[PDB]
From a paper:
All BoNTs have a catalytic light chain (LC), which is a Zn2+-endopeptidase that specifically cleaves neuronal SNARE proteins and is mainly responsible for BoNT’s neurotoxic effects, while the heavy chain (HC) mediates toxin attachment to neurons and delivers the LC into the cytosol. Here, we aim to develop single-domain variable heavy-chain (VHH) antibodies targeting the protease domains (also known as the light chain, LC) of BoNT/A and BoNT/B as antidotes for post-intoxication treatments. Using a combination of X-ray crystallography and biochemical assays, we investigated the structures and inhibition mechanisms of a dozen unique VHHs that recognize four and three non-overlapping epitopes on the LC of BoNT/A and BoNT/B, respectively. We show that the VHHs that inhibit the LC activity occupy the extended substrate-recognition exosites or the cleavage pocket of LC/A or LC/B and thus block substrate binding.
JLJ-G3 is the only BoNT protease inhibitor we have identified to date that is able to bind both the isolated protease domain and the holotoxin. However, the CDR3 and FR2 of JLJ-G3 form a concave surface that captures two surface loops of LC/B adjacent to the VAMP2-binding groove which should cause side-to-side clashes with the N-terminal region of VAMP2 when it binds to the substrate-binding pocket of LC/B. Therefore, JLJ-G3 is able to block VAMP2 binding to LC/B through side-to-side clashes without directly occupying the VAMP2-binding interface. In contrast to JLJ-G3, the JNE-B10-binding epitope on LC/B is not involved in substrate-binding or the interaction between LC/B and the heavy chain belt, which is consistent with its lack of protease inhibition activity in our assays. Structural studies predict that the JSG-C1 binding site on LC/B is highly conserved (only 1 conservative amino acid change in B4 and B5) and the JLJ-G3 binding site is identical across all BoNT/B subtypes. Binding studies confirm that both VHHs bind effectively to both B1 and B8 subtypes.
Residue numbers in the entry:
A (entry chain B): 0 to 116
B (entry chain A): 2 to 63, 67 to 425
C (entry chain C): 2 to 116
Write the structure that this text describes.
Amino acid sequence: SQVQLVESGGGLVQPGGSLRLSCAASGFPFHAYYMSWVRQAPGKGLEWVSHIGNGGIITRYADSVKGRFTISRDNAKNTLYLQMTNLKPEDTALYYCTLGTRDDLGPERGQGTQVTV
Amino acid sequence: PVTINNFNYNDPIDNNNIIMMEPPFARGTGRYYKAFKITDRIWIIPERYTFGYKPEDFNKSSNRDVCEYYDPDYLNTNDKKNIFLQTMIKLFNRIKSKPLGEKLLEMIINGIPYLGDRRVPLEEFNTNIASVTVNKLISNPGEVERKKGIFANLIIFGPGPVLNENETIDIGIQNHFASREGFGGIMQMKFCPEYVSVFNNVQENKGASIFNRRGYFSDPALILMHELIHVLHGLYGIKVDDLPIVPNEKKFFMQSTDAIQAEELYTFGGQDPSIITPSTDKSIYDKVLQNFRGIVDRLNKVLVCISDPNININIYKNKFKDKYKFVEDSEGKYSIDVESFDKLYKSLMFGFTETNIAENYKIKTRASYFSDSLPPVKIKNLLDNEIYTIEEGFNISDKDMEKEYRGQNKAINKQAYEEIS
Amino acid sequence: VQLVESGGGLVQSGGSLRLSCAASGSIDSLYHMGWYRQAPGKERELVARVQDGGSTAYKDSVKGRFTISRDFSRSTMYLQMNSLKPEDTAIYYCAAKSTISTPLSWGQGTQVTVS
Ligand SMILES: [Zn+2]
């Protein structure tokens, strides 16, 4: 028995457009875990984008994307959402979904999705 | 007296009885959860217990019966969370309705952890540890994170991966536990109130042939009060360290002969501690007194609290003088009275047990902690007063269920429960 | 690890003062730095504290008025006290803890009198 995180919502949009990212979780009780979006950009190290608590009350964003991104979950469809708005070139990267918080990122990660503005 | 708060799960976060709380093992991680203050120093967090587990441990599946029942969907909606919370409120009012259980709540509420642990120098009070404080989110959930450490004694979660496996849990650092060393520490519990245990180790069954044996299911209030007794031990720092106890024979009250933690046998009461040799029993007593000696020695040396101004050192030295029943002299310095230590040691270790609480609440329990695991059942609706009440549990006189604990009898009250299969 | 305080006051009620704590080593990483005051024939109190992350706390009786500052490059901790009342009259110490288990090393103190 193992976990699966598969994300969708990818590719070029013009700056500054919008893009919705998504992630489907299987193999564990989704509703019981904090979830994070993390991105990898060219030449740059790994960067944490946002996280959300079990019940969606707690949301946290990097200051890099704060005015622009919103983080959502639907515990019924076992889906995680990242809504990207006012997209910049700075945002072009490999977007991952992974368990836990900024300060406790957890091993499980998805395949990854590419976004390019 | 003890007051049990009432609330709904969707009630707003007012930071009075409902806060967003970062529990001890999640310290500095940023994980907050909606917490509900059922009583002073006691919180209910209607979430699954996940720390120390793999997320796929919750999902285990396959004509056989196993002792462990899994259900990952438990507490997976706000309405489920609210049922858990209302059930917990009802179980606590159940506990409060006899003098014996209200007293238990009070010693738990008043049993505050020492301000520090083994790592803290004798001179200081330090409240900045996971076993003395938790983080309260004081900013709005919308805003940049700001938090404040509050005191707390007990935090109750929903089940981990195995639903019927209720457990009381202490905080361990570098292989030591403040809860086992005189200090006390914030206690935690994973609890699941409707998946209860079943037992047939009762003295009436002792003569009985195989197909004449009786079967009962537990009162969840008693399952909880048992867990609260571990909680009381951990708050007074006397919870027994790793010490498995091996019987030299099956005795009449036993059903199995497996090794059991000494902490369990004292908690169960009955005849279970007769299994413990007086030699090991004396050293447990010796170790506690030595730990209490270490506490009083601190109380004479503490000059400062380094973490929290607004903490009054004098006030707290006095509160702890009450917790541990220490005696004071003309220097203002404290010391142990061994005669007064024995009173406190006895009430904590032998005063509250599962056995005497069951007798006092008129609840059928098992004859000994040395009993086989049976498959657990599910109580359909503890919130329905036709099945389960605050005053008498399943054994309601008005439904003729009071005699011979028929309310708990699997062969009689089959509408109270269903098989988990 | 050594500490020396400076900044001594006979200042009028409502005036202000800046205390200084000089350390023999690096102060950026310490588990604990705090300002303490002991009145004549009374007990020490924690006035203001900084934690290893930089979380700072204050006694209620001094909030708004006292602010903890920190110069790493000079390894020095300041207490900037404004609007001092006569009640703030005491000998002020400065203590530091290298770890949760390192005992406090104290300074000799610096006096504050508030007519
Ligand atoms: Zn137990």
